[PDB]
Symmetry: D2
Subunit: 140 residues, 4 copies
């Protein structure tokens, strides 16, 4: 579901039940250095003024950047979790899709850093989100 | 109606269909300088690893900081929208609630800044979110 | 005069006495969309542990992003100032130079956003700095 | 010099020669949870338009937050270095002093997080800076 990296035999929460399944995030491409994902805008993505919620751009960036890290480190016995997210909002999105492209810009032993651009259907850059992903050894 | 500030007679999206109403955000207190909100953790707030989604903390902080700005400025002919958000994640939340407390730290003519704390049922500080809120004349 | 954009006949502080001239920042290229600058590492750029000061990367990014905004908007009656800066530090620099490359990513009516990369003499990416630049009518 | 924590018998760079000594940063109070410092504004602190440089607020926050961490962890065999700094600029400072107050808001095993308020001589809040400080075991 959502085409998230398949790194474990089971997961605590089914895709369709998570925030990500609820709003409809879907991953398209995914490599160690770059990953893309998108979502259809519907009310569930919007806030009361009719624009895509700022939290939705943060949430798509976070899932994409974290899972793109999980895709690499999980089989190395590590876990990956968001430690910091900085999002800037340049243009509202009223409808259509949001498309996210994540580029890896640093991969340290304790911290990976991704830049995520969020664009509307015309290709305009509506938001960007910088994420720092902590990598730590798994607890079992 | 999540108890959001009732500033207009019509809104483009009803509470219950917004991302906010979908995950269950509810505002408890609101004054010009300070506001609080909370949410019950359910799967809809979680990611597949069973923890509250990073985007959920961002979304809660975004709605609370923005709407507490709306509450003041709307009657002044102004629109308020999120311009930037920086969220840092200190401890995960697996279940219970997330409680948010937004404190206004600067109210400029064009920009309001709010610090938002996010705490678990034990009161521990699990994340913080700084929100910068652009304030502009409402377009006809 | 650090090669900063020559937009006015007088400036309140001469280059050589500013923080910029004190540490030795010099702009190499400037266009509306992209600009570069660099500095020689000396003790004046370092902290007591012998590494380049975190504030130095921030200062370089701040001067480069702002003044590249000044270069466009000054002749339009506008002032440009730093509104927010987020800097992330990936590898220390002990000696040599720091080279900065600022790329404009959004140019709004009130806000320009620039991403700045900071690299060592080996070309490695040592820090990044996102700058948000407020653009306002110049006060008489 | 500058009243920085005295944790080692020698340091790679003398205070008066560092960025911090050059601009005149001085620490006043310092405890595990809170630390204050200040600096006299002079041209060396300013940029060409006559206001305190954005980099100077970042640099005072960074030195104060990092050294406040060093004060605690150094005798535990750890080093502390800035990993991320997010600074927002609310009001310019033309002259007098900048006074920084750093409050610790989270102390993890790998990351300490400090909020630093920067005020002018009238007490007005002119900038804030959030820092994440990485703590790692020393390399010898
Ligand atoms: C933050 C962090 C330690 C995270 O490490 P990481 O993400 O785990 O990366 P990794 O550990 O993969 O190693 C990356 C590089 O970091 C350095 N590093 C990592 N761990 C250590 C360590 N325990 N000891 C020394 N260097 C280390 C080292 O350069 C390493 O390269 P290599 O020697 O292994 O090739 C690393 O990214 C880093 O060092 N970043 C740069 C930190 C920096 O230079 N910050 C700016 C200075 S902020 C401090 C400041 O301004 C200040 C001012 C005044 C004052 O009085 C005090 C402080
Ligand atoms: C960013 C902004 C303009 C936003 O304005 P706002 O949030 O709407 O606040 P508001 O407009 O309510 O006014 C707040 C104060 O800002 C100043 N200000 C605001 N608008 C203006 C304007 N159009 N013209 C002049 N001052 C203004 C003024 O001090 C005002 O106080 P008051 O005189 O109105 O009482 C305001 O918060 C601000 O001025 N912040 C401080 C900016 C600052 O000092 N940044 C760092 C330095 S500039 C970046 C830099 O380091 C650099 C380095 C080297 C170099 O070569 C060039 C630049
Ligand atoms: C922040 C700002 C207003 C700054 O404006 P700027 O940097 O000067 O850009 P500029 O003014 O050049 O205009 C860019 C676009 O912004 C929009 N915009 C700018 N000013 C205005 C205005 N006064 N009125 C309406 N739209 C405006 C408009 O789309 C404009 O495009 P155009 O129609 O002019 O072609 C603009 O960049 C912006 O609109 N960014 C997007 C803001 C956004 O979508 N944020 C997240 C959602 S709102 C936060 C939230 O999640 C929330 C959640 C729950 C809740 O209950 C309430 C809120
Ligand atoms: C980031 C970090 C690991 C840094 O750890 P630290 O600063 O070293 O703190 P310390 O390690 O002192 O321990 C703090 C707590 O962190 C947790 N933690 C630390 N290390 C680990 C670890 N190796 N394994 C599990 N938990 C850990 C643990 O809760 C610990 O408490 P305790 O069990 O020891 O009492 C910790 O601060 C943390 O876990 N922060 C919260 C991370 C978080 O919840 N982020 C939000 C989610 S972002 C991810 C996301 O949204 C996503 C969405 C969709 C999707 O498909 C995937 C991901």
């Amino acid at each position: 579901g959502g085409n998230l990296p398949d790194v474990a035999s089971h997961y605590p929460v089914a895709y369709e039940q998570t925030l990500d399944g609820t709003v409809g995030f879907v991953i398209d491409e995914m490599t160690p250095e770059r990953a893309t994902a998108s979502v259809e805008v519907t009310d569930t993505l919007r806030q009361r003024w009719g624009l895509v919620h700022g939290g939705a751009y943060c949430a798509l960036a976070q899932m994409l950047a974290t899972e793109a890290t999980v895709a690499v480190v999980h089989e190395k016995g590590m876990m990956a979790v968001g430690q910091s997210n900085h999002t800037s909002f340049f243009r509202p999105v009223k409808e259509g899709h949001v498309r996210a492209e994540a580029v890896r810009i640093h991969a340290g032993s304790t911290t990976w850093f991704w830049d995520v651009s969020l664009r509307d259907d015309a290709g305009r850059l509506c938001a960007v989100s910088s994420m720092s992903i902590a990598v730590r050894p798994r607890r079992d």
